[PDB]
Design an enzyme around this catalytic site. Structure first.
Site, PDB file in Angstrom:
ATOM      1  N   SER A  29       0.826  -1.211   0.000  1.00 61.73           N
ATOM      2  CA  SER A  29       0.000   0.000   0.000  1.00 61.73           C
ATOM      3  C   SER A  29       0.860   1.261   0.000  1.00 61.73           C
ATOM      4  O   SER A  29       0.410   2.339   0.392  1.00 61.73           O
ATOM      5  CB  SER A  29      -0.982   0.014   1.176  1.00 61.73           C
ATOM      6  OG  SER A  29      -0.308   0.152   2.414  1.00 61.73           O
ATOM      7  N   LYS A  72      -5.189   5.803   5.691  1.00 62.05           N
ATOM      8  CA  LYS A  72      -4.161   6.490   4.919  1.00 62.05           C
ATOM      9  C   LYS A  72      -4.314   8.002   5.014  1.00 62.05           C
ATOM     10  O   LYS A  72      -3.343   8.717   5.286  1.00 62.05           O
ATOM     11  CB  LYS A  72      -4.224   6.032   3.464  1.00 62.05           C
ATOM     12  CG  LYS A  72      -3.959   4.549   3.268  1.00 62.05           C
ATOM     13  CD  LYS A  72      -2.489   4.223   3.412  1.00 62.05           C
ATOM     14  CE  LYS A  72      -2.209   2.766   3.110  1.00 62.05           C
ATOM     15  NZ  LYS A  72      -2.673   1.873   4.203  1.00 62.05           N
TER      16      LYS A  72
END
Lengths: 72, 72
Positions: A29, A72
């Site tokens: 990621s 995030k």
């Protein structure tokens, strides 16, 4: 296209530190992060500040979704 | 017969990604998938959209039968 040499996987080595990659995310990621990091290092262009990134990368170069964009 | 550069195995390097690692079973059930993927990449022609397939390949260019076509 960005100042990189035509061949640099045959004449330039690479060390890639990562602070904490044993993340709860199953995948990295942080693919495009490494993409721009490698591009900046090998092309000798400074990676900007205040722009924090995330997203996977494919060999063709398509940025797939990532899990948990809230975190995030 | 399928539009490739006449030198692709001597001056063009290649990388292949298969998700979720390999199949822990014996027999790569995506042989013709690899064949058509490599051909499309080297053809410099856009491949089509959502054409599922499976099986294996031979040295002469034939499709071998594969077990477990059911769950697929």
């Amino acid at each position: 296209d960005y100042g990189l040499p035509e061949d640099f996987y045959n004449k330039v080595d690479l060390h890639v530190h990562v602070p904490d990659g044993a993340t709860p995310k199953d995948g990295p990621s942080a693919g495009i992060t490494m993409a721009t990091a490698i591009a900046s290092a090998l092309s000798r262009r400074p990676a900007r500040m205040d722009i924090a990134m995330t997203g996977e990368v494919s060999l063709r170069g398509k940025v797939m979704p990532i899990g948990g964009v809230k975190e995030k």
